[PDB]
Amino acid sequence: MLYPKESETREVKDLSGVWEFRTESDKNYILMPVPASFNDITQDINLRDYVGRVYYKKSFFIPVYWKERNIFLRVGAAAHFSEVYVNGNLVTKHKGGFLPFEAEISKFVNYGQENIIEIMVDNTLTWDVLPPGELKVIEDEMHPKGYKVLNYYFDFFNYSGIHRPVVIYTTPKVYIKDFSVITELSNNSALVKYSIESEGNNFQVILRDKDKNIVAENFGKSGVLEVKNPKLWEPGNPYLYNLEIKLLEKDNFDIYRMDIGIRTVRVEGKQFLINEKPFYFKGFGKHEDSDIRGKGLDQVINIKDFNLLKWIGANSFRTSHYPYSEEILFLADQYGIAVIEEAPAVGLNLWNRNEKVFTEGRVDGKTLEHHLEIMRELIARDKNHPSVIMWSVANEAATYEDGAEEYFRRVIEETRRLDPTRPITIVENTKASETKVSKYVDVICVNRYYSWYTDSGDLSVIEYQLERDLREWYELYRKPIILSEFGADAISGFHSDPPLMFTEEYQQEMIKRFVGVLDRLDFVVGEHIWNFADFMTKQSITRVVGNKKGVFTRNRQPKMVAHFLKERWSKLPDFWEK
Amino acid sequence: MLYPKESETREVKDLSGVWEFRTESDKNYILMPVPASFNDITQDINLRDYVGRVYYKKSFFIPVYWKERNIFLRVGAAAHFSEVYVNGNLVTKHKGGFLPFEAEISKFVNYGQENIIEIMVDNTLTWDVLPPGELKVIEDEMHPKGYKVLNYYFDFFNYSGIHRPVVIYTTPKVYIKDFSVITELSNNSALVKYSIESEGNNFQVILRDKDKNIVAENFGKSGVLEVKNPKLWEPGNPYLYNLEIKLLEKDNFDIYRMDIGIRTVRVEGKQFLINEKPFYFKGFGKHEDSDIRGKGLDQVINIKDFNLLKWIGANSFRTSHYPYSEEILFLADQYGIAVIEEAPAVGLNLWNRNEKVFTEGRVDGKTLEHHLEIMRELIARDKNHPSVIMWSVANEAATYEDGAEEYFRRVIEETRRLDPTRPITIVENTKASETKVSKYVDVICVNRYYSWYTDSGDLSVIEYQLERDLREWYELYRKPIILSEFGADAISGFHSDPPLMFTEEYQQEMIKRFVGVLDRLDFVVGEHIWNFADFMTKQSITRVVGNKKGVFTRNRQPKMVAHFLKERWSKLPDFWEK
Ligand SMILES: [Cl-]
């Protein structure tokens, strides 16, 4: 499914705005913005911590002239289970809170009249949705009848609601359903190879440069476009060409356009190559999180975040720990930021080797089935973005378990089959010698928190422990390694010398000592600090109103270590043969 | 041993000030203030976290006229093992970091000349000092040779150094060594009964009121002083009489004076009676802790703290979790603040029922021997302060263990034998039905943290859980109950609605809901919030630069809940028949 875009042949109507909202088995509505998480909008603590079904409702008018058009209703994201009703008719259901879903609804609309859309969203986690969790009953001596808790083991808050825009769009009855683009370098040219999915068959395809000059054209539902003297897309030079696809049939006419970038990505030895040059990742793990709206899409915050990425000198980030909005990937295309996009397989770990995760009752064949469908949906959505340069299949799963090996072999095999054009990783906090899964990926991503979660407060252990660990990863697997997470919680304004945990000084010193180690290791091709910004988590005595490891505050202002990273990364080239 | 006080017959020389300081097996000195903890004075992180022996050194001059006087060298406190050298001569050794020690040193001084005092202090904890801990060797795959950690399980930082003043004082060769005072009410009079310890035998004892009027006198080494129409000491009316003791012998003359207060304390049924009226404790658990100086005595901070106690309307505190400086008790006498003074038996708990504490290898007969000596030293020091109204033998020990019963039976039995004039408690976090120790004390003190350490964030459980729990304490033991701790960490300036853990709002709402429960229970005779002020702890992912449960910041300014308590406690009488 293609991102909804207006053209000569397609209308788009955005239903974002103020909706009516209620919780299960309640008749009274309140007002609720869309897109947004509902948790922080009100002062009702029982809604903040609500677990169950909520219902959104809105009126909309369909123009009579949309008859004899396809009418699609698209929901960008709703966490985690959703059902969509048009005038009381169920038009689609969806499982998974971080990818879009849509249905054709012309059969159910009142033309030239009022219509009602209702969207049910259920935030109840189970062990066969990603990320997983479990609702548990607690009726003991200290809890009243009916006390229940939603348990989950990922470290970000279970925000719920409609997190990305709801839109209605039209197409002709015979229309461009999808297309695939692959770019190759050939002699002094680039090739853009394409295939179009449609019931139609007569297509003209045109490629235009930045100045609207036509640089290539082809008649054909599949084909190759040759670009002589191409300008390649890469961090530091985000050149985009505009691909125009025109269906020209007897009764149907359809146009779809997308900006694409010409680049190659390849792993060879201990090098991560973009356009055949050795890349060095400088960046962050991020989160879709901001004040008040929770996980809701906000283009103000998105553009602010990319300007901060360019300001600090980052060239990349990982979409920890789930696919982000398409909007963020289009921006990464424009700004020239390399993206590792990650499936929502986070929380597959009970920090305890006595509780097994990959076992009947928890992560099983049903979870695997969902994970495989997720990879198919994710690659289908994002396969044409130049900014996505790697897929991450999971974050900190219990990869030391025997059952994790067969599980992830299947996930990894399916991902590569779906997209052979990008490398694959998995983000590990398991010990190097214990993971049964990292031997199957292209690039190793390791999260390490020496002197924070272990030997807390003792910065002196970092060089000893980190160098020994990373050398063992390389000795066992002989793959490029990204230090995919490291950092320390810092309360803005907490200062100390000597540095103490939770101060800005400790965060900067820890990060500084980690990267001094990486500079001595020629097989380390990247550093991603956790996290870009402070974000909300569930409440616990270990979380000082959320996770405070941001390099920026939640309102997008820098802590001390942001300036250290700006100075370091201004000296580090994007392409660096270590 | 009596607090050093100048008189017509006694000189006092305070050696506090700037000393030279070094660590073990090092020849170079730095400067170090005394009294103070050494940990936060410098920018040397290796001294902040030092474990082992440190050495203080200072020159002093003895006047030739001190010949034929006793010369005593007193150390107010040094944590935790100490040795005192005068001109290289060992004059005393001491075990325990929170009580004073002294020696007579006239045999070792150079009269009319320079002298050198050196004090060794060792902060290495063991299982037979209080509070206990253990130095552990960690030489594994991730730690270099010689890595060691001091483990301990009490929740305050192991500050070390000379924490209370070092002084030298003179007495005549035959002198007042000690005295005991007990006050009784009789008809319309009060009696002050006394006994004096001395090699002398001829004494005149005089009692003076606030205006220096003599109200009673007696000739005798022991005797009774009758005060007609006494003004009693109590919170809200801290009347002090001055007791003057004069030794009058042939060759020796000695005078010692102390302010005393006339009051009785008695537990009867579910009432805590002071001067036969039902008291209600309003107050705090405190700590000896302040910026930069750690646990060092500071009279500025002490007077500030008492003015804040009076401002907020408190009438009491507990010396969590160790005896405080004598200076603080003299101030509590002046201000009329009731003190529960506690022995340093904190940390006798490995939050884990698989690791036993009262067992060979940990808390054993050697620990018990030290605990019993501590109770003797503590009562000998503080027996004459009107402000001390109860002894606490421990805080949050593993009282569910079989071995804890015999241990504490002996501690409690010895405490009562040493001082039958004050009730005894033990501060519990064990479950009511599991403690094997609370049945042996006079008043129950229970620490409860519902919605903070358990059901974190859910304020709705408080009333259900706390009322059920406290009713079970009373049903099992039929004693008065003090809620001796409850509270929540709050970062100053962290605000939210709805309230979230670590915000000022959550701290206030939790405390408000707890005390609403207490008001409905006629057997609850007290509320002590944890803590008076933010204080330092060892580093851990659960401590945001120390413990943030203070009602005041570490620099002694109020958080939101301080104003809630001021308003509540301004409405609650000190004496309240519930
Ligand atoms: Cl983290």
Ligand SMILES: [Cl-]
């Ligand atoms: Cl606490």
